[PDB]
């Protein structure tokens, strides 16, 4: 399928394909156009021609009844998207399921926003008359990754939709598919030639040349802190444009003496199996009060034990390169004399499969507890008082996230309180809610991104000053 | 009057001190020319010291703290600087070398400054979402920590004063970088940190240059965010090193180069007025300036003929370079106050940032061509507009690429109003509300059963 | 005009139709051809206390369940189905109210846009969080009132019903609503509609009744939880004083008011008569904030009948009591010495209106018109400014600093800068001084229908 | 200590004035019977009066002065709180007769209150709508006008704070009335009044009765707006001459039975002390005052089961059925460590002020306010500005 401009799947300017593997049964799915440097130049030249006296003149009332619109055919295709979602990343389809719905509420939730930006009126002491408009940025390209592909195409078309910005979407070479079937569902629910453009490509190639363009008015990056660096380099080399980043962090999960254990190991279950771990805040650190220990960890293992079925909740992680990084990080934590509760090997010959891995008696500092290792992957440890917690917890300069589960409200408020974390979960773990924003403390981003907050980032303030008698 | 000060130092800890180094780099006067005096040098070795005093104080002093009392500081901060106002306006008059008219003006506009951010303190709020039953969920604001800030030399205390408010609004420790060419402001101002009594490293006033403390601040590890007022290609570097060392968040404002739009019906009296000072105000050291300016093909004679200090040698210089390119590109034309005339369209006179007293004269015919002329620019910081008709002044004021626009107005510009760019002049808007969401960082919690 | 007929009469309760209890019907008058078209249900104090008992039931129980998400979600199939049959609401609304076909059809997208916004507004509402305090925690939450009473007025029947019920089931309270006597048939035809969407029983009830019997028993109900007026301010000080004997319920109104219209000489050549005939000739006069009396610069001071036809613009008053008092308004306005220019009154215009008699004094709610004169820019203000009603205002002028100048200074809360009598569920209407309590389009109605709760954690 | 008489008359016009009646009335000490003095007393006249100045006070001073300048004012005014704290504290023990301690604390919560607002005045936002059109429309904010302010006798200064607060902040001129009580506090205030600088008739400060006094501002005819603390059946009256008169906005404070909650699993010594403190603080003079209290299974002393009622809940929902079955919620508070009986409960509880783990703690940025009979209209933190601002739109058409 080809690069979605202008309302029309064109093809690649120099014809370039790449290919697309299905991690299941490691067989080739297809070939995807590939964009390079003209092919983005041109894209962005469409999503300025609509910007241009075209989507300017729309109103906030119609942008969300696109919006709307986008919504509901998301919604009428629930089963055909989460299957282009398992077929090219590897999900658990009953998952998969669930990470459309979201899609569902995402842009609807961003639907209703778009008529409700509003500037200010600032009554200055003078006798004079100012407005503070909020006006769209322009062009936006957004570079996303491929742990929630669907997921993180709504994230960002929504907001940047709302406020009236056109866009360039570059889909991670990894996951191709689901994005360009989304753009088709684009042409139905009635948007404007260019408003809406998705690319595929490389990061070094496409991601890049978005990143350099300077005809670009914001980029926003989803993806590893590395890139990140990457790209705002690239920002200040080009146009000094706006960006906004939300790299992953190895956040934790603790349990206290009061709290409940079966929801405990439940949510820790899910809060670093759940995407095989490879979504940004997992919980690869989990921080068990010493009284609670030696039997919670036990009742861990005992949880512990094709996407396309419906009894599967683990999946093939994305590419063996990631497979391989992940086999290697295994046997940094084993070579640095960890015990392995269970966890260690691949399952079956074919496929990159990878067991939920434990790790126990690990030190504070090993390359497995503070480096990102984005599998199935996570480490135990005893702590006492309320201020460990806090400082094991928090001994880490990647803080997009974390948890705590208690039955004392003093403790559940004075350590989410003092931890340095985006998110806090109280008795709860990776339940992300559009309501709500989401973002990175310090190294983990640039910005937030769900709720009203995502907003901000996609529009800007004109002061327009009245002076006068 | 004219004084002698004892240390000069680096404010650190609410204590004067001199680089570890031993380091000094002399402050001259643009009028005579002599040296004032020599003032301490900070390097990566006092930053660092800085640094440290900020994250001590950031962790478990001003923690502590309420947004009341918090605010009680800001409030006395003003008080001494409304006390000593014509000191404080001598000391910025000779140093950058303005009239001491701006005794009000400059140095009144830091008490308003400083004032409304005390105002801001109590006034933050979080948020509650109700999601669903059952569960709970809320957002709230936290101080960013740490935050290095490097101020140009035009408005040394009044820019002094928009980036202590925020940020101390807030609940961030701050480590402040005076420029090279005008340090002594912040110096008294930062004896007045201490008296209004603030507790120590809340606020640290460094002196250097920026190939070393700036880079210094920029780089640091344990600097949480930096906020950069000054020239484009210096923020290019400043967001280059934010990349390479720690994320750490990056405000800029650059200056840029800003249009005066006269109509026919424009009230001429007032249009000739406003656009002076706009151009000149401030020698056309400020940012937000009428470099180029615009008039109606029928009033444009009739207009033209109504119409007609320096901080050190190297910023007198480019203005002398440019001022040779003017001639040079054909054009019709302490320093004298320039003004070009029947300059085309395309020349580096108009394209480029001159930051001194020049101005170079357009005319245009019909309203959409002053929207093509404004707007085709890299630089967008501010713009104006100067008519009497209400269908055009909003319709163009909207379409100008701009982030502050004047009608009927020019260069007047008021703290509870957002200014900032957003054509490369500058990555967030810095005054009012707005400010202060530049300063702090959202957490979400979510409880649930 | 079409065959096709489900009109219900019952009492809307429950998601079901349900008929009075002592049974009292009474009729439905066409003002185009004054004959009756049919006979719908009366409610009274027990029909009244019952209703209010099913939302309060529903308030009570079905909406610990619901999120902000549905009740969004929810709206939104109501506004479809109003924008499925704007075809049938119009003709309802035309035949019911009298007007034309072509207007109603208007008032229904007006419906629809204010519907979807508020369905936008239910997932939206943010209590604030409070960090000033050391070692404590103080939340601010939002919630719903609870059981809120809605008394609509028959000049825009259909639109009044959205602008009442969007707000407050977006926020989470259940209402019980009582149509105007003169037009039930509307309100009805939608709660139809409600039951479709899939809204909870008992969550939107609709009453027909009279503002005395069906009127005062809403807001002198003690399980009432807050009522909101539109109409008359004779009846605004009505259901003030009720809802004080009773049990101080939380009051919105929103009454009438004599609204300006001023001209300066700057202004614009046609489109300024153009807008000032919309201006006191829409929709027959009978809007609030419709412009009774024209001021003018002293330098420029010098259609028919059937609604159901395509061609008509003005239509039938609403009824003989509404054309008799609108004659007796123009007999006194030619009695007072004022020159002079089924149901259906003809637009009349009065001129030599030079002082301010009874004409002026006022509203009217017909199509009257009253020209003045000024000259200066501080007159017109303190022209238009003269009442004790200020709602709406309007400027035309090309002119800046006069436009700015004369809107901050005149005292309506809404003015109109170079149009006239176009609103927007966006942005929010309301009255100064006597023409209204609260405001009700826009952000500012969900003010009135959420309560604000401080909760206070200690810690240590 | 006790004091010189002065005029001790209406503050009209910045400058203290007397009744055309010639009526003054009596003030009497709770502690020893005795006879203070005698202040005059307003009646309709003198309140058409001040409401006049308050009118052109309104008309034309306030609109050259610009939003920084009110706050200035405002917290000038505190300033001058926090110089005769002293003096002020002692006043209003000897006028209304509570702990000189107490009264160190009622003022600070003053000069607080005041200065919060003095934050506030050049906060005040407007909106600017992106109407679908190619037009352009914002939403502005402007004062009400004239206003009247009844005071109980309980916070006679406190009460005095915020009310003028929020009142002055958005731009408004004011005409405030004294609790027949307690009038004393109040004079003074308005000495305080002119020093900060405020332009004459911005601040009218009037003496006087219930009825009297009350009807005149309730039914003035050219008072824009009343706020009313007090009683719920005074409320009521104050509703019913808006209606009669010409349909003033209401905002109104009425006091009633809030409850204290305390499960077993909350600590013992902070329930014991907070509940001590919520009704026996401030004599159980206070709106806030929790009059019920449940567990889990001229001087008067104070009482229990200032009075108190102690009964016993056993599950859950009957703690929450005993709190809210009542016609009266203004307040409430729970005392627990668990964390989701903590947020289950304030969520269940219809009061406008829930404390958890503490009683009677109130702060001048949280609003504070009435659900049911307990209040129309919340007044303190941001939200009072609503009650004292209004809303006006405009819409431009363009080409």
């Not at 990754?145 to 991670?172: Q, R």
């Not at 206290?256 to 690869?284: L, M, R, T």
Request: charged share 20%; glycine share 10%; proline share 3%.
């Amino acid at each position: 399928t080809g690069l979605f401009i202008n309302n029309e799947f064109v093809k690649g300017q120099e014809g370039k394909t790449f290919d697309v593997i299905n991690p299941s049964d490691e067989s080739v799915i297809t070939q995807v156009h590939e964009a390079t440097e003209k092919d983005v130049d041109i894209a962005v030249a469409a999503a300025r021609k609509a910007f241009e006296g075209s989507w300017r003149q729309e109103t906030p009332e119609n942008r969300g009844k696109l919006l709307n619109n986008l919504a509901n055919l998301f919604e009428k295709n629930i089963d055909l998207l989460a299957a282009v979602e398992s077929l090219d990343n590897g999900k658990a389809i009953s998952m998969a399921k669930g990470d459309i719905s979201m899609c569902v509420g995402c842009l609807r939730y961003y639907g209703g926003w778009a008529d409700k930006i509003t500037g200010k009126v600032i009554d200055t002491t003078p006798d004079t008359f100012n407005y503070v408009k909020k006006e769209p940025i322009g062009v936006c390209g957004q570079i996303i990754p491929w742990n929630f592909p669907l997921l993180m195409w709504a994230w960002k078309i929504g907001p940047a939709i709302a406020c009236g910005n056109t866009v360039v979407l570059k889909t991670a070479e990894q996951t191709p598919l689901g994005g360009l079937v989304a753009a088709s569902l684009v042409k139905e629910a009635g948007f404007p030639p260019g408003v809406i453009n998705v690319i595929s490509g490389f990061g070094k190639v496409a991601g890049a040349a978005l990143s350099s363009h300077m005809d670009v008015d914001k980029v926003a990056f989803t993806g590893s802190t590395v890139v990140g660096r990457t790209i705002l380099k690239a920002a200040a080399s080009s146009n000094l444009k706006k960006v906004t980043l939300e790299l992953g962090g190895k956040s934790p999960n603790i349990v206290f003496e009061d709290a409940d254990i079966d929801n405990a190991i439940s949510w820790v279950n899910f809060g670093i199996f759940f995407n095989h771990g490879q979504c940004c805040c997992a919980g690869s650190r989990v921080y068990v009060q010493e009284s609670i220990y030696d039997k919670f960890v036990q009742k861990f293992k005992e949880r512990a034990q094709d996407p396309f079925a419906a009894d599967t909740f683990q999946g093939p992680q994305v590419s063996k390169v990631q497979f391989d990084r992940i086999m290697e990080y295994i046997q940094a934590g084993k070579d640095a004399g960890a015990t392995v509760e269970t966890g260690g090997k691949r399952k079956g010959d074919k496929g990159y499969f990878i067991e939920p891995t434990i790790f126990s008696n690990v030190t504070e500092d090993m390359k497995i507890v503070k480096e990102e290792i984005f599998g199935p992957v996570c480490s135990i440890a005893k702590f006492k008082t309320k201020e460990d917690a806090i400082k094991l917890g928090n001994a880490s300069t990647y803080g997009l996230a974390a948890a705590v589960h208690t039955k004392n409200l003093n403790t559940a408020i004075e350590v989410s309180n003092a931890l340095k974390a985006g998110t806090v979960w109280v008795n709860t773990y990776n339940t992300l809610h559009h309501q709500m924003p989401f973002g990175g403390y310090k190294e983990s981003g640039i910005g937030r991104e769900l709720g009203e907050d995502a907003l901000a980032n996609y529009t800007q303030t004109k002061t327009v000053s009245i002076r006068l008698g």
